[PDB]
Design a protein around this motif. Sequence first.
Motif, PDB file in Angstrom:
ATOM      1  N   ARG A   1      39.590  26.798  43.195  1.00  0.00           N
ATOM      2  CA  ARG A   1      38.290  27.444  42.840  1.00  0.00           C
ATOM      3  C   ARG A   1      38.249  27.803  41.341  1.00  0.00           C
ATOM      4  O   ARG A   1      37.259  27.437  40.695  1.00  0.00           O
ATOM      5  N   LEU A   2      39.281  28.489  40.820  1.00  0.00           N
ATOM      6  CA  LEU A   2      39.482  28.845  39.385  1.00  0.00           C
ATOM      7  C   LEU A   2      39.936  27.612  38.612  1.00  0.00           C
ATOM      8  O   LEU A   2      40.958  27.033  39.018  1.00  0.00           O
ATOM      9  N   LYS A   3      39.247  27.268  37.516  1.00  0.00           N
ATOM     10  CA  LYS A   3      39.605  26.118  36.640  1.00  0.00           C
ATOM     11  C   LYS A   3      40.900  26.445  35.892  1.00  0.00           C
ATOM     12  O   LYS A   3      41.638  25.525  35.542  1.00  0.00           O
ATOM     13  N   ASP A   4      41.155  27.725  35.641  1.00  0.00           N
ATOM     14  CA  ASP A   4      42.403  28.193  34.981  1.00  0.00           C
ATOM     15  C   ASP A   4      43.030  29.272  35.858  1.00  0.00           C
ATOM     16  O   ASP A   4      42.800  30.452  35.638  1.00  0.00           O
ATOM     17  N   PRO A   5      43.853  28.897  36.861  1.00  0.00           N
ATOM     18  CA  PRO A   5      44.465  29.869  37.771  1.00  0.00           C
ATOM     19  C   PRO A   5      45.459  30.823  37.085  1.00  0.00           C
ATOM     20  O   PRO A   5      45.870  31.775  37.742  1.00  0.00           O
ATOM     21  N   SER A   6      45.806  30.560  35.815  1.00  0.00           N
ATOM     22  CA  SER A   6      46.760  31.371  34.996  1.00  0.00           C
ATOM     23  C   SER A   6      46.349  32.853  34.981  1.00  0.00           C
ATOM     24  O   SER A   6      47.237  33.702  34.739  1.00  0.00           O
ATOM     25  N   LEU A   7      45.064  33.160  35.217  1.00  0.00           N
ATOM     26  CA  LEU A   7      44.547  34.546  35.317  1.00  0.00           C
ATOM     27  C   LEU A   7      45.390  35.345  36.319  1.00  0.00           C
ATOM     28  O   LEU A   7      45.624  36.541  36.065  1.00  0.00           O
ATOM     29  N   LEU A   8      45.814  34.725  37.424  1.00  0.00           N
ATOM     30  CA  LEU A   8      46.532  35.403  38.525  1.00  0.00           C
ATOM     31  C   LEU A   8      48.014  35.012  38.542  1.00  0.00           C
ATOM     32  O   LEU A   8      48.730  35.580  39.367  1.00  0.00           O
ATOM     33  N   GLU A   9      48.465  34.101  37.668  1.00  0.00           N
ATOM     34  CA  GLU A   9      49.908  33.781  37.474  1.00  0.00           C
ATOM     35  C   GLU A   9      50.603  35.049  36.967  1.00  0.00           C
ATOM     36  O   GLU A   9      50.423  35.413  35.779  1.00  0.00           O
ATOM     37  N   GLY A  10      51.309  35.720  37.873  1.00  0.00           N
ATOM     38  CA  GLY A  10      52.022  36.982  37.638  1.00  0.00           C
ATOM     39  C   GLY A  10      53.525  36.783  37.534  1.00  0.00           C
ATOM     40  O   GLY A  10      53.992  35.640  37.391  1.00  0.00           O
ATOM     41  N   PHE A  11      54.258  37.881  37.593  1.00  0.00           N
ATOM     42  CA  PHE A  11      55.737  37.908  37.552  1.00  0.00           C
ATOM     43  C   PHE A  11      56.153  39.131  38.363  1.00  0.00           C
ATOM     44  O   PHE A  11      55.334  40.044  38.522  1.00  0.00           O
ATOM     45  N   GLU A  12      57.356  39.085  38.934  1.00  0.00           N
ATOM     46  CA  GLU A  12      57.892  40.125  39.834  1.00  0.00           C
ATOM     47  C   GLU A  12      58.413  41.249  38.921  1.00  0.00           C
ATOM     48  O   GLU A  12      59.080  40.906  37.868  1.00  0.00           O
ATOM     49  N   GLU A  13      58.082  42.519  39.209  1.00  0.00           N
ATOM     50  CA  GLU A  13      58.697  43.634  38.448  1.00  0.00           C
ATOM     51  C   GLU A  13      58.646  44.944  39.239  1.00  0.00           C
ATOM     52  O   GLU A  13      59.037  45.970  38.656  1.00  0.00           O
ATOM     53  N   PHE A  14      58.225  44.949  40.500  1.00  0.00           N
ATOM     54  CA  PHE A  14      58.441  46.139  41.368  1.00  0.00           C
ATOM     55  C   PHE A  14      59.328  45.743  42.562  1.00  0.00           C
ATOM     56  O   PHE A  14      59.171  44.622  43.121  1.00  0.00           O
ATOM     57  N   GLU A  15      60.263  46.634  42.917  1.00  0.00           N
ATOM     58  CA  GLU A  15      61.375  46.354  43.877  1.00  0.00           C
ATOM     59  C   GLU A  15      60.879  46.563  45.316  1.00  0.00           C
ATOM     60  O   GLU A  15      61.708  46.779  46.214  1.00  0.00           O
ATOM     61  N   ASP A  16      59.565  46.493  45.511  1.00  0.00           N
ATOM     62  CA  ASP A  16      58.836  46.503  46.805  1.00  0.00           C
ATOM     63  C   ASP A  16      57.864  45.333  46.701  1.00  0.00           C
ATOM     64  O   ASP A  16      57.938  44.628  45.667  1.00  0.00           O
ATOM     65  N   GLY A  17      56.955  45.148  47.660  1.00  0.00           N
ATOM     66  CA  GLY A  17      56.049  43.983  47.641  1.00  0.00           C
ATOM     67  C   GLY A  17      54.665  44.336  47.133  1.00  0.00           C
ATOM     68  O   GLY A  17      53.733  43.499  47.315  1.00  0.00           O
ATOM     69  N   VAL A  18      54.503  45.528  46.546  1.00  0.00           N
ATOM     70  CA  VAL A  18      53.158  46.152  46.374  1.00  0.00           C
ATOM     71  C   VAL A  18      52.452  45.440  45.217  1.00  0.00           C
ATOM     72  O   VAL A  18      52.974  45.499  44.104  1.00  0.00           O
ATOM     73  N   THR A  19      51.326  44.789  45.503  1.00  0.00           N
ATOM     74  CA  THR A  19      50.497  43.992  44.548  1.00  0.00           C
ATOM     75  C   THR A  19      49.353  44.837  43.964  1.00  0.00           C
ATOM     76  O   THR A  19      48.778  44.444  42.942  1.00  0.00           O
ATOM     77  N   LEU A  20      48.992  45.912  44.640  1.00  0.00           N
ATOM     78  CA  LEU A  20      47.895  46.806  44.229  1.00  0.00           C
ATOM     79  C   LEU A  20      48.323  48.233  44.554  1.00  0.00           C
ATOM     80  O   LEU A  20      48.717  48.488  45.671  1.00  0.00           O
ATOM     81  N   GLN A  21      48.285  49.117  43.577  1.00  0.00           N
ATOM     82  CA  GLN A  21      48.430  50.566  43.822  1.00  0.00           C
ATOM     83  C   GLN A  21      47.463  51.291  42.898  1.00  0.00           C
ATOM     84  O   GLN A  21      47.643  51.204  41.698  1.00  0.00           O
ATOM     85  N   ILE A  22      46.449  51.906  43.476  1.00  0.00           N
ATOM     86  CA  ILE A  22      45.460  52.746  42.762  1.00  0.00           C
ATOM     87  C   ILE A  22      45.706  54.195  43.194  1.00  0.00           C
ATOM     88  O   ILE A  22      45.587  54.519  44.408  1.00  0.00           O
ATOM     89  N   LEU A  23      46.078  55.032  42.231  1.00  0.00           N
ATOM     90  CA  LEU A  23      46.493  56.422  42.488  1.00  0.00           C
ATOM     91  C   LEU A  23      45.507  57.337  41.757  1.00  0.00           C
ATOM     92  O   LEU A  23      45.154  57.012  40.613  1.00  0.00           O
ATOM     93  N   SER A  24      45.044  58.410  42.396  1.00  0.00           N
ATOM     94  CA  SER A  24      44.126  59.394  41.772  1.00  0.00           C
ATOM     95  C   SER A  24      44.712  60.819  41.812  1.00  0.00           C
ATOM     96  O   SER A  24      45.393  61.157  42.776  1.00  0.00           O
ATOM     97  N   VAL A  25      44.439  61.628  40.792  1.00  0.00           N
ATOM     98  CA  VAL A  25      44.834  63.054  40.747  1.00  0.00           C
ATOM     99  C   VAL A  25      43.629  63.896  40.344  1.00  0.00           C
ATOM    100  O   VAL A  25      43.139  63.738  39.233  1.00  0.00           O
ATOM    101  N   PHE A  26      43.156  64.728  41.265  1.00  0.00           N
ATOM    102  CA  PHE A  26      42.101  65.743  41.049  1.00  0.00           C
ATOM    103  C   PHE A  26      42.322  66.441  39.702  1.00  0.00           C
ATOM    104  O   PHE A  26      43.451  66.802  39.367  1.00  0.00           O
TER     105      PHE A  26
END
Lengths: 129, 400, 376, 374, 154, 154, 154
Positions: C234-259
Amino acid sequence: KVFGRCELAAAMKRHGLDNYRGYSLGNWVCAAKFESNFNTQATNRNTDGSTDYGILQINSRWWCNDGRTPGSRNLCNIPCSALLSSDITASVNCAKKIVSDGNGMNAWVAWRNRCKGTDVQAWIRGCRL
Amino acid sequence: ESIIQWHGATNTRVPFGIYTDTANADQEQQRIYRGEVWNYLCLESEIPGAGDFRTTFAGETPIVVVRDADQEIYAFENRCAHRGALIALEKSGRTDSFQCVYHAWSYNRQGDLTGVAFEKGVKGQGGMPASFCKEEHGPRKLRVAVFCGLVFGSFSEDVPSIEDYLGPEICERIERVLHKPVEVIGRFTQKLPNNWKLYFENVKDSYHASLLHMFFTTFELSQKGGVIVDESGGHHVSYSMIDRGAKDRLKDPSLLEGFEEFEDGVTLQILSVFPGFVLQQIQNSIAVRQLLPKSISSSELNWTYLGYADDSAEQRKVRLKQANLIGPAGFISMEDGAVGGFVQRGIAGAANLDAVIEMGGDHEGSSEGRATETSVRGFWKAYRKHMGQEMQAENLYFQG
Amino acid sequence: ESIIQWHGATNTRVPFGIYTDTANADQEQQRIYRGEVWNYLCLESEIPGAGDFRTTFAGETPIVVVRDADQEIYAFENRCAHRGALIALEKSGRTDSFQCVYHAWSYNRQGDLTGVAFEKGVKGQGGMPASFCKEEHGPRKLRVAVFCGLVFGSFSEDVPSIEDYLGPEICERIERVLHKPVEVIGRFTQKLPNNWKLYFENVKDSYHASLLSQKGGVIVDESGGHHVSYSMIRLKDPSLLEGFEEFEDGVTLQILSVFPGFVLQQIQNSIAVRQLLPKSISSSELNWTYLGYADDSAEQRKVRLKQANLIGPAGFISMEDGAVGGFVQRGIAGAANLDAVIEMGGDHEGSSEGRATETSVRGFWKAYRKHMGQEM
Amino acid sequence: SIIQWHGATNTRVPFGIYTDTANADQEQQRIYRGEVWNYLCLESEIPGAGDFRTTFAGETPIVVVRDADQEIYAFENRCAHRGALIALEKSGRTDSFQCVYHAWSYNRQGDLTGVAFEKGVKGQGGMPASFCKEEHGPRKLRVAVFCGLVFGSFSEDVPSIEDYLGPEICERIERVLHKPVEVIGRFTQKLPNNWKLYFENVKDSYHASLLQKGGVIVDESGGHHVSYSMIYRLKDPSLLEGFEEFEDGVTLQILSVFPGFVLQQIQNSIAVRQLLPKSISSSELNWTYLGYADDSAEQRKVRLKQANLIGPAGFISMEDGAVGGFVQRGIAGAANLDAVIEMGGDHEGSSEGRATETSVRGFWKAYRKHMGQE
Amino acid sequence: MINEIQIAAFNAAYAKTVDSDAMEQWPTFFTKDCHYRVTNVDNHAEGLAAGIVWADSQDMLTDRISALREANIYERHRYRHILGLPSIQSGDATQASASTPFMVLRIMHTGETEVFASGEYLDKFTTIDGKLRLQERIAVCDSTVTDTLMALPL
Amino acid sequence: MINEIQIAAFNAAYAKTVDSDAMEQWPTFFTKDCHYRVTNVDNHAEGLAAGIVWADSQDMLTDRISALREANIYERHRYRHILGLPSIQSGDATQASASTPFMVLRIMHTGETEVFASGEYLDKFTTIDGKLRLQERIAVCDSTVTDTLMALPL
Amino acid sequence: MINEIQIAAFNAAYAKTVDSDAMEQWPTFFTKDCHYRVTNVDNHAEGLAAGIVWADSQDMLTDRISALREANIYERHRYRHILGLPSIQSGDATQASASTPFMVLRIMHTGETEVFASGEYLDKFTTIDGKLRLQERIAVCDSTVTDTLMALPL
Ligand code: FES
Ligand code: FES
Ligand code: FES
Ligand SMILES: [Fe+3]
């Protein structure tokens, strides 16, 4: 403007039409010879309501917009008046789009009838190139 | 919860809410601008001939000021007595009479309704009822006073005379500068991002002005200064002066190349008149300022730059060079536009806290030297008097 | 006549007046921003050396935050104790001390009045009365707290420690990301045409976010005020989502909020912080701080620069986040007396395995009503 | 109180009425969402099934839409979830509406037909058993169509548009909208004044007469009026070269319907106006310029030339944009004073004169009635 | 002849100098005995000579910039000049009188963008060592109002 | 030589493409291996590399516009580009480096008109088949503030 | 041939004429048989013919200005036109169609400056007895909203 044969050859080369999509410089010079006679202002009304503009006689129904031609497609995205300047830039850029459409230079009637498979390279001989 | 709570009967503490409370602003309109004050309107020389008029404001309220054939000057509220449209739509002009464009009611130069379109119906049909009387409808007219060409207006018949309002010390300091015919040499307006009061305090802030003037003579003669305050507190003069006849950076020094033209040593004289007039003399730079409120956190400053009519070419050139000291781009006055805003913004979370104004003690009278805030405390003495914000009944009972 | 009448004790119903009442907003200033909360100020890496400062806001209230020689960080209200002018006029810089330009009062990096121009008069004339004492006048100082490179400020003596305020689950989720020195790689501000609360609700809206082989979840601290939305293996340049491993869990998304206005986000290799400030009843400001790690290689940094297209004002993911608040602000124009409906995932204001829930949103309002004295 | 009426009479209007923000919020709950008909659009602007437009009834955004049954419906543009606008477009054509925030679906009546993840994902979360789609929805409006004019009300109790208008204004509308009309242009004016100042001005025959035989009619409520009129040189007099097309002599007919509808005929210039309040001191005026569908080329050209008389640059109507502002600014120091409206007496009924303010006093009779200010 | 293109190019370089805060290069655009003034249409119509800025030598321009650096206090902001095409009223190969429309946006460090001034430059151009210089530039502003203050020249 | 007139004409066609919502033609203005970035003068002054938009291929530009059509939700609006004269820093017959001032108005479908962005394009131009293309365009914005969101590129 | 240089010069003179209140010279820019119209993108997109201003002769332009002077009452204000480069859409040896971007600031006598309109001039040019003239100009505005009123033509 009426170009000299060699003047127009030199201007077409400096705009990289030499071997452009198969076609040696002489084809382009020969085409302008029999389309316009090297006259940047050449102008030919067709009975179809369209006109042919400038040194390469580019048609106002397909290629440039002259404001007068029912069904203008304007595929070079230019007013036809830009093909009537002393300066061949806009005429060459529209040509490059025409010859790339992939009917090659057969697009130029006068080039088929008078240039195709002749000694083309003759139109370039005796010129500072 | 009142954020307009005065600490005591002293003016060493100003509630920051005074610069924010919208109900308090509306009181300022009723009790100050349309109360017993004199509002600066224009110079007499700006409307020299009969019919010459200008439009301006007394607080929120638009005003027409006009010369009549008698050579007297009148002023009235710019509000049609019909359905309230502005009467005069132009900054300035010349007219025989004023006319509301909405329904063509006519007003003379005093502000009297002289004419009502179709008053008597059309073919004995409609028009005003027999009970209607032109002379019972009209914009509020202002009592006008002209002092050394300064035109002032009040909405109150009971307001004291301009001479008594000003006091003798301020009358003389105005006459000092406006001693001759003046000529307007330019107008400029500043839109100030602050409550009007912040700019007027700043005009009266001798502490700020001395700080800055002291900084300005790190660059390039011994001077003494002082601060005069009228009995009401509302009017001040900040001055600085050489002792005529004592002993003892710029690529174009001509900016400060001045000429002597007052019979004294006064180099700087800034005079204020409650609630928004300034007259200034800084070397040969003469100007008037008119301060108007616009919104709780916005005010308008109108500059009228002045020459004397008798100026030679060379004398006028000096005032044109020295104008670089004043106005929106002034070497001296540039920052005067922004500090008001710095306060407006600094107090955003402190509406319930108080400004500290203790320089030179509690007093609201004249002082030698300028490292004082007496003229600022004076502003608030005058303000609280007009606003009925002196110690109330209940709080007086408790203290006494 | 009260449009800030809560229906029940439950938080399934929010009065639309809460986004409109100006008196209620001024209470938010007194009770939230200058109450028992931690306000995000800046990153420790933005003020590394002694004298390095920034200016920002805690709610309506402007703030100076500065590093001192002791290597500690201080913060005080950006208000001169004289007549109230802003003290520091610049977004950032390095200074020995602060000075109000109006009348040249000097403040040290703690916010103490150290100097008063002409305090002793000029030639024994005027100046301060004998009774005037510098140490009795000053801007309100803030308590400062640091956590893995995040600087927070509070006006409240009574506010709990940052570790107790955050709680252990949020402490761990922050340390997960900020376990190393970070480096600012860009800043951008968005002016949001909505009440602050609408944007903060939206950060916590897992229901909304799920609309835009992975399992997810939603964590909520005990107070309700802080959340974590997470996702993991679908993407002509998939490099946008070409990532690298750097967290020692599988978590791809973490959004954290503090009041009441802090966000930390990790989306593949895209790390950023957000500060949400209120500005007017119907406008708020979102400040983005985009982050790399100081130890990043060229190639790793390039990845974060490409993946940033997901976030910020033009984000493939976050673009709409700017406008939805406004859509609500405008949709409720004739409904100040009606209630928002928040029933997804029940009455619950604690953690959930789903993301088709509004538990973290109800959490926001539990914490809000607590601070605002609006429970029942 | 700057909204204290002097007496029962309407010869005196408190200038505070144009300034008090609390009073404006009452206008929203008592007028725009009270017993009135709000003009929405022309039926010919949403001809086919699914054709919709968005606008306003006072502050409150509105969707108006044609269904397959060829009927027209209208509902508040507010998602019943967390309050987001549902339809984000000026106009379009859709099978159903969907809130972009959390993909709740609404039919063209404004019924909630769909809730994204209502029943959880993998039996996790979703709505409680107690949650019922048909209990949540934007407020729907009662819709009425009269000579193509689409009106909406929030009130079950409001009378029919024929009863609301009354017979005199029903006939005056039919007079001009007697045939199919065609939109030939839209333009919006942002007015620097309280809405009431512009609506007063539409009704101000006294003003209009300044700028041969004529009259002013007022419905029983006071809220609706009709102003009517009948009989240096121009280098091109073609601007006023008209053609006959009304069965009477009437060359000007300006009609108003409380609280913000105007229909006008000036020679061959036909137009509709929609007046919306926006802030205490600003309002929006939306022009819909009209031809008749059966117009010839030459007849249409006449309407295009005569349009120079109306709208934002109108030879006639240019001033109409500014006079409201002139009053807003003239009264800046006079919140506590009263407008004087005595032209033609205390009267709030029809008159043969135009040197009267009866239609203006009518506005205020209707206003005070709706606002409980008698 | 000095022409519309040469003035346009000069104007864009002037604009870049002022907009980039390279203010020390600003006086180099003027002759030694030049005139520069910021005024408004009201003053210009009544013949009133005073300026917000008023200079009759390049040295006075240099001092205004010294004072901006070393003296003036103001909240950080920048200008964005948007210019129209010059119109030449009169001129030979070495003098020309011209008017150039201008708009100046002001952008505060806090990010607010506002139309700060608009009007036309009434210019007198001369030619020194083959290059265009201003003998005179009068920034005639459309508005009598300046918001807050004017730190940087137009 | 590539000149200021040729760049100005290129800039006006780029502007018309973006302002006319012909967004699919927008990538055609760039080389295959181009750089495009929207940033601000604060980031540019520090040397911070992040953009609101960041692209190092024409294909990334194409995907951004696919996502605008297929994915992104935003309230209808258009841009009106007002551009200054290009100023050429270096260039031969085929390459050129230049800076072009810009102002972008945003007009909402509801009619509100605002200055949405202003700044300069820091450009690197090359010549492909005798036409000007951007090897690099950095839209350096004067403001750190974007109002609501940024849907269309600058 | 009509070219971009000639239209640029024409556009600058048109702008100066309208912005200087020399409105009597405004019809001089048009042919006897011309069309002038102020509309918006919505009307232009749906094919709707009506204008805020609508004229099919130079004489109707002359009448509009007579009425402005003699008849129309409006609060004093002035325009500041900032124009972009004209872009020629069509042409033969004698006629040309072009589009020119525009922005019009409105400055009230009281000093308020606002973006009052923006859009493009869709123009038909001819060249008669050596004078370049508008056969047609359509001011297609980006906004459906006009603030207060429109007194002066665009
Ligand atoms: S409002 Fe002035 S005449 Fe009616
Ligand atoms: S207000 Fe800060 S020193 Fe006076
Ligand atoms: S607000 Fe409409 S679906 Fe959530
Ligand atoms: Fe009228």
